[PDB]
Amino acid sequence: SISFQNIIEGTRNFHKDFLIGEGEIFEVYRVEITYAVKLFKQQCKKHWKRFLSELEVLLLFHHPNILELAAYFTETEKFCLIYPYMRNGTLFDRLQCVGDTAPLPWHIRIGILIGISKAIHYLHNVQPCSVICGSISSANILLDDQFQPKLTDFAMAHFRSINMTSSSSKHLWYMPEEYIRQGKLSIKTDVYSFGIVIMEVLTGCRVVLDDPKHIQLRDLLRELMEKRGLDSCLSFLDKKVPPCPRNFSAKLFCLAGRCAATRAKLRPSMDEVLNTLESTQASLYF
Amino acid sequence: ISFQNIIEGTRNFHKDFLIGEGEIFEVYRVEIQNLTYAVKLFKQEQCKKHWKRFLSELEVLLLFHHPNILELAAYFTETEKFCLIYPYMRNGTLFDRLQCVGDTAPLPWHIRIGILIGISKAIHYLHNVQPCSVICGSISSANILLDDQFQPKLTDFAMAHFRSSCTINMTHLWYMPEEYIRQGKLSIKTDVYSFGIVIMEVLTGCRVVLDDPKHIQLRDLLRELMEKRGLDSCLSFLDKKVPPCPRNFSAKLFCLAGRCAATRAKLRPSMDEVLNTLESTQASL
Ligand SMILES: [Hg+2]
Ligand SMILES: [Hg+2]
Ligand SMILES: [Hg+2]
């Protein structure tokens, strides 16, 4: 519980110095009472629909693996959303090791890979009408001081039971083919985007590889186990951390490939993604 | 508040506590902590359509406040049951008051125009909110509640839309203009058309559809009176349940209700112009 005047001077009148980042339709600030506030960036036709979907899901749906909405402010012709600040920051920031931080151990990886997996199952089976997260990525997964994950960016979340202009630019590299070439946003578009972030925690590489040709990490691993070999995928395992059992590594490449499939019918559901993902956690420690 | 209070004060949502059943919700009466409230429950029972309307209620009630809009005091998401609770307005809905359902004292004119002004103030507020203009799309004499001091409160924003000149896939429409019915077009001027119906419904005290065998509508009847025999005949349909109002008063409201319910949307006046007319005609009373 806070007031607007606490934020007005707290964010130093939205000072450019007190900014954590500017995303698609927001520009996140840092506030202390510490919090992170998302200020509505003002074509309201589509930007406003997103701000709604964000506040819709957070108020109506709660889960320990979802960044909990603290409060909302609609005052002084300004809309904004306040959030509890995450100490570990973005997943993408920690497994890429920005700021020369410590790499993520394998047990935390499979830990926050299950945590996010548990939430996306919760959302796919909400009672009124199932909701599709849509914009899931290693950039929208935050980690607290205990390194436990939190979802973000429910702006392109849709309820289910179809327009490419409505897309999120940064989330392009996670979208399936039926979403791009056919516009069909399915229930299985989250398991697709989740199979890619499994690849990102197995191989500490970026979403799109920095090679001169600028090829996708999905397509690279898509061709290794398709032609060369399943163990050839293991050549790209993140070397910044000590090794892990070959059965733990194999089961995750086996799963990520089935999740990040072009054809939608052959793509699994989050429950069995979570079943195979918790059993893999035992293969690590044994 | 607490959802445990609601489930008790409604007796597991028993039939004896519902005040009315809307198309997509269920309204119940709940009294907790020496105060009474009106809970409105999602008609759980397709999925996608009814759910979107649910969000329309919650969005505009949390983002936009005005003295002439029924506040949302709490909302609950637990036990898969999604309900909205409202401060119970003890003077019922405008419709029930114009019809004197419980043999209530019929509304005097000064209250009748106070209500018209209050609702026009709220609709003006919504049409000019900063992020995107919101249009109500569900104005009715049954969606206008009256507090203890007979001050109008606007409800039922389930059909509301955010506009930057719009469209609605069409898949009991007595207040909607001919472009919404025939062409699906819905706009800011759609509210003023429905607001004109209310002015007609306030002046006459009649129902929107007259309870006769042929079921002729109100505006269609008043149209005939004003086109054929002019404004002098419209004044014969003033509400006889209350003493006569000044002719200058009643004459300006009929002309106003005529423009507000103009058949073609291009001509209908902006809600700002209406509030100006409603204020200057209260002085004439
Ligand atoms: Hg692979
Ligand atoms: Hg008339
Ligand atoms: Hg007149």
Residue numbers in the entry:
A (entry chain B): 152 to 184, 188 to 196, 201 to 319, 328 to 452
B (entry chain A): 153 to 197, 201 to 319, 325 to 331, 337 to 450
What do the authors report?
Interleukin-1 receptor associated kinases (IRAKs) are key players in innate immune signaling that mediate the host response to pathogens. In contrast to the active kinases IRAK1 and IRAK4, IRAK2 and IRAK3 are pseudokinases lacking catalytic activity and their functions are poorly understood. IRAK3 is thought to be a negative regulator of innate immune signaling and mutations in IRAK3 are associated with asthma and cancer. The canonical catalytic “HRD”-motif is missing entirely in IRAK3 and replaced with “CGS,” whereas the Mg2+-coordinating “DFG”-motif is slightly altered to “DFA.
Here we report the crystal structure of the pseudokinase domain of human IRAK3 at 2.9 Å resolution, which reveals a closed, pseudoactive conformation with an evolutionarily conserved cysteine residue located in the regulatory spine (R-spine). The asymmetric unit (ASU) contains 3 molecules of IRAK3. The αC-helix of IRAK3 is in an inward-oriented position with an intact KE-salt bridge formed by K192 of the β3-strand and E212 of the αC-helix. Another hallmark of an active kinase conformation in IRAK3 is the intact regulatory spine (R-spine) formed by L227, L216, F312, C291, and L309. The presence of this evolutionarily conserved cysteine residue in the R-spine of IRAK3 suggests the possibility of a redox-based mechanism that controls R-spine assembly. Closer inspection of the G-loop interactions in the IRAK3 structure revealed that F177 anchors the G-loop to residues of the αC-helix, β3-and β4-strands and to the Mg-binding loop. The hydrophobic anchor F177 thereby leads to a rigidification of the G-loop and keeps the loop ordered in the apo-form of IRAK3. The dimers are formed via a pseudosymmetric “head-to-head” arrangement with the αC-helices as central elements of the dimer interface. The interface is flanked by two disulfide bonds formed between C202 at the start of the αC-helices and C287 of the αE-β6-loops. We further identify a conserved C-lobe surface on IRAK3 that harbors asthma-associated mutations and closely resembles the previously reported IRAK4 homodimer interface.
